[PDB]
Paper text:
In addition, the new 1PHTH171-G(GGSGG)4/6G-396kinase659 constructs included PHTH β5–β6 loop mutations (Q91A, I92A, I94A, and I95A) to prevent formation of the ‘Saraste dimer‘ since that structure is associated with BTK activation. Three PHTH domain side chains, R133, Y134, and R171, provide key interactions with the kinase domain in this new structure. The Y134 side chain inserts into the hydrophobic stack created by W421 and Y461 on the kinase domain N-lobe in a manner that mimics the L390 side chain position in the autoinhibited SH3–SH2–kinase structure. The guanidinium group of R171 participates in hydrogen bonds with the side chains of S453 and Q459 in the kinase domain. The guanidinium group of R133, in contrast, points back into the PHTH domain forming a hydrogen bond with the PHTH N130 side chain while the hydrophobic methylene groups of the R133 side chain contact I397 and Y461.
Membrane-induced dimerization activates BTK and we present here a crystal structure of an activation loop swapped BTK kinase domain dimer that likely represents the conformational state leading to trans-autophosphorylation. Together, these data provide the first structural elucidation of full-length BTK and allow a deeper understanding of allosteric control over the BTK kinase domain during distinct stages of activation.
Author numbering: 1 to 16, 19 to 83, 95 to 175, 393 to 659
Amino acid sequence: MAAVILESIFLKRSQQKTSPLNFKKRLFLLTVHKLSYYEYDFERGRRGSKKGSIDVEKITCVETVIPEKNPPPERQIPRRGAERFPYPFQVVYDEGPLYVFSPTEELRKRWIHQLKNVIRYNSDLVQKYHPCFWIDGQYLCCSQTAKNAMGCQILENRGGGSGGGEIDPKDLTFLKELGTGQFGVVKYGKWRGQYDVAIRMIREGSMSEDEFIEEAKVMMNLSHEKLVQLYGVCTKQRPIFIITEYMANGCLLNYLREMRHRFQTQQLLEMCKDVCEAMEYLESKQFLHRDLAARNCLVNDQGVVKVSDFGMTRYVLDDEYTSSTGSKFPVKWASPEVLMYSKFSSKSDIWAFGVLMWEIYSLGKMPYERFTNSETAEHIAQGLRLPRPHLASERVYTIMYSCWHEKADERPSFKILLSNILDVMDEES
Ligand SMILES: C[C@H]1CN(C2COC2)CCN1c1ccc(Nc2cc(-c3ccnc(N4CCn5c(cc6c5CC(C)(C)C6)C4=O)c3CO)cn(C)c2=O)nc1
Ligand SMILES: [Zn+2]
């Protein structure tokens, strides 16, 4: 008994090369599972038989379509403010694009919104799309001769949807606790009892909410297989929620400290590759993490590590964590220029990444265990560096050691570190 999210009568266009285009009226049903269209008995006002359906999980984008240059009377905007259907929108999926015409502009805006609410958790959401129709075996925007051609224009939002990231909490279900972080409790749940999600309940007074909500517009569009995805936010309540991807195995630091796993060195290097891939992607987007550490990484059910809580440090209101000398400040992961002058940059993240590799190959051991936070800050500025873990070969140690140079300009980039890791994987394996 799946809930029907919407119910409307649309003008569905047939999906073809030399075949004729036919438009027919259909009743579309939208659920969390499928998007189906039926025949409609208008005289009896009754839904007819089913003529087709599309898997929700297979939809990659929903957006409007540039109207036709010379449409027929049935699909023209009226000259004077279920007969007319002059407002089209497209649903992109493997089986080419489905084109649906709406009678009113407001109705089209409601379906694109609800459709996005239903596909925002899909893993195949695209960042490009064809803003024009597909006619004569070709696209009118790019002239590609394949319905599965890569999008020719950039979408304003990942997966379409034209805020757009406002998830309604009535469809969320809390099922299990996941602990507490800097912003409060985090729980495991499902959206419409289907898509697994993690719900971050932000304690009031712990986050600069207004500043983050402005950045969530950009973080939502960031997507990488090794990056914990941000789905949306719930900001019409107290406290607000942040819906993100769910990671079953949890924190990486704890994951490394369970001696039962008995990791192989190949597994440890794969963890470094996963993180490096995510940082390289953030590096390409001018995005900084500012707090890279094993504690801030997560592991999924398949043992894949993903970077999480990237850029969230700029909104922490706790001074004990923001101040360079606060008890919560990550002194043991900060570069000398950060502790001395607060000079943050991509190279400061490279330093933390080198410490992250040291944590992975040390199986969650605290760095500079014999030193306190104050003792570490004074000694790392003099030349104190972490030793080579026992499970780390000399070549692997050379990679993490290169991240700890005195001059930030002398440290490698995430693009070079990935090449170094991929090189070791190809030789030491
Ligand atoms: C593995 C099982 C084991 N289980 C035992 C077995 O019986 C009990 C307990 C549960 N446990 C478990 C399972 C799954 C998960 N998954 C998730 C955890 C978290 C999570 C939870 C609590 N605190 C945090 N942190 C920690 C980091 N951080 C936070 C906010 C900020 C930071 C850094 C900052 C200062 C920049 C700001 C922050 O919120 C996080 C990471 O976001 C987030 N996401 C998306 C998840 O998917 N975690 C734990
Ligand atoms: Zn195109």
